[PDB]
Design a protein around this ligand. Sequence first.
Ligand SMILES: CO[C@H]1O[C@H](CO)[C@@H](O)[C@H](O)[C@@H]1O[C@H]1O[C@H](CO)[C@@H](O)[C@H](O)[C@@H]1O
Length: 158
Amino acid sequence: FACKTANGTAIPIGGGSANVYVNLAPVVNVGQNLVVDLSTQIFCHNDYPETITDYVTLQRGSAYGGVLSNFSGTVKYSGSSYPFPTTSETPRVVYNSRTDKPWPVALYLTPVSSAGGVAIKAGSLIAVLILRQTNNYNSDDFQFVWNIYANNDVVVPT
Ligand SMILES: CO[C@H]1O[C@H](CO)[C@@H](O)[C@H](O)[C@@H]1O[C@H]1O[C@H](CO)[C@@H](O)[C@H](O)[C@@H]1O
């Protein structure tokens, strides 16, 4: 089991960490949702699907920078909503193919009432998403750490 980003950064067998730079809606109003869809940026595959089945959870979702300070939101994992920050390991997603399959994570953030101006600064850390991978074959327990960075400013009009 290994994962790669749309840009090309790979985390090999055994886990690791990588940086993901995401484009963001450049304007968001109070009452609107800023969507961070990582299912288009992070992909994974099962290296030995003929005999092994890999299981993948969202172990932890942390908020940073302007997202931590100016936003409140949820995380959508494999079609279901969970609190963000995610404080407990989610249910499992099955990876049973060698062809790359997206990691179905997406953040839905809304600006807080007091937000205004540059709510997210370009190049800043906004989130860390930890992908925990196991299997039905041995005791493998690997963490794929995804550091989510904003490519551009996100402004809240005032
Ligand atoms: C075939 O190589 C994989 O399987 C053997 C055991 O059959 C492992 O010892 C080896 O490290 C490889 O495991 C990788 O791929 C597995 C299936 O994707 C995954 O379950 C492992 O955690 C590891 O990534």
